Ligand binder design. Sequence first.
Ligand SMILES: Cc1cc(C)n2nc(CCc3cc(O)n4nc5ncccc5c4n3)nc2n1
Ligand SMILES: [Mg+2]
Ligand SMILES: [Zn+2]
Length: 324
Amino acid sequence: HMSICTSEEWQGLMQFTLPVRLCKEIELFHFDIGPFENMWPGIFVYMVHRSCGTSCFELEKLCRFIMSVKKNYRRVPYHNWKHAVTVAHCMYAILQNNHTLFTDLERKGLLIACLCHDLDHRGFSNSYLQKFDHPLAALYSTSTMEQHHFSQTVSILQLEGHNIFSTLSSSEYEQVLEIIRKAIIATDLALYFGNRKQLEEMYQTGSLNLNNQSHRDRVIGLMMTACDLCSVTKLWPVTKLTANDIYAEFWAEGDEMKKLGIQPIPMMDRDKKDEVPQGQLGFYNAVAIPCYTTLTQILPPTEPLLKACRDNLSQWEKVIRGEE
Ligand SMILES: Cc1cc(C)n2nc(CCc3cc(O)n4nc5ncccc5c4n3)nc2n1
Ligand SMILES: [Mg+2]
Ligand SMILES: [Zn+2]
């Protein structure tokens, strides 16, 4: 039930090389992949290589994986291929700026995790799918979509010639899959609020321990969340744009509720469009800022992410105040 790439597709990727003028900028947290669609798969390979060295995966195998992952992203407005690469890039930039805090295994796991994190997203919320009553809510019922995403990845990994993790020992294979699973579940925004509070706590008492596996899992989780939302960390015109994409999805969901005579909450209501900039401010304040704030505390190199968020926040304020 999975989808495979064609030989055409994967072999062209083997051949790709990144333009030198992009090399500098790929390393910046605010870097925007948006102009270079074309090169997106290429960019991930680069990033894998620059992160994990040029023979961490058998090149032929890596390309097959990436290009198939691409195939199993739907053509929805926001949770699409582009989202996946954007999130993967942000993790790349976190990983590079904290290089020795994380194991080889972790960096492979996470870059792959981010690339895979919203596989086969239909554009409908976890709420919806349960709240009236999709066959996927019938299979898992806490963090529905995520357990699906993780499943998808695994299905993709277990494809013929697709297993990039093969030449690890079955210990290390069975370990990265754990890293990938927890990191993908982490992306369920529901879970984030708990995780942040604990991490808030632990840092503040001075009991957070990177040698403790469970603390480790949590920081990673926060990292995942920080990457998931990073559109809120790009320069203003980029971010403005992305917002349109996230709303396009929500509103389409709201239409499907309206079609069954059910009032959607205001967020997925295209008839409540002016309330949007006020929607954002709220989101930055309750979710975004807190997210990045705690990640900069734990991981001080991740500070620019926080800085960019603040700058976007004030743009939104100015919109609400009528100055845009
Ligand atoms: C990149 C990104 C990622 C995620 C998960 N989100 N989630 C949001 C929703 C923000 C929000 C919350 C809310 O309660 N309302 N109410 C509203 N009424 C009207 C208009 C917008 C509203 C709104 N908007 N924006 C995101 N951007
Ligand atoms: Mg998700
Ligand atoms: Zn996501």
